[PDB]
């Protein structure tokens, strides 16, 4: 039982690490999409004229 508990704890740590990496990936993608949107807004304001 002690070995099984040890395996569970050691797995849990690296699981936390993997989840954090996923968070970072999402952050980067959203950061780029923001600038895409800003440029589109400028083009539309230009084209109304």
């Amino acid at each position: 039982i002690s070995e099984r508990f040890g395996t569970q704890i050691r797995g849990t740590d690296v699981a936390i690490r993997n989840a954090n990496d996923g968070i970072s990936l999402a952050q980067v993608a959203e950061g780029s999409l923001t600038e895409i949107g800003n440029n589109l807004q400028r083009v539309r304001e230009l084209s109304v004229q």
Binding site: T7, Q8, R10, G11, T12, A15, N18, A19, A29, L33, I36
Partner: protein, 98 residues
């Protein structure tokens, strides 16, 4: 992988395809013609476009195809806020609607 055992994982399906060659695809209906070539004496034109009346117009006795084309184009363009159709005149006497 978010678990300590085989088979415990979640997935991300897809984000977006944001290349400028495949963003905001759309279609517009176009290709209108009239084939109008009336001449000689003047006339009054009536009728409805897309369920909206456009009033009446009048041309002089010495009318020509170019004379009537521009009058009808003006009458159509007067109500772009409701019909949503843009009309362009043509030299021969036809019209193009987009």
């Amino acid at each position: 992988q978010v678990g300590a055992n085989a088979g415990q994982a979640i997935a991300i399906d897809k984000t977006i395809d944001a290349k400028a060659g495949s963003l905001g695809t759309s279609t517009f209906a176009t290709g209108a013609t009239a084939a109008l070539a009336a001449s000689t004496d003047g006339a009054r034109f009536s009728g409805t476009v897309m369920g909206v009346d456009i009033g009446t117009v009048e041309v002089k006795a010495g009318a020509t195809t170019a004379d009537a084309s521009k009058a009808v184009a003006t009458a159509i363009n007067a109500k772009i806020g409701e019909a949503g159709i843009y009309a362009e005149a043509n030299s021969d006497g036809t019209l193009k609607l987009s």
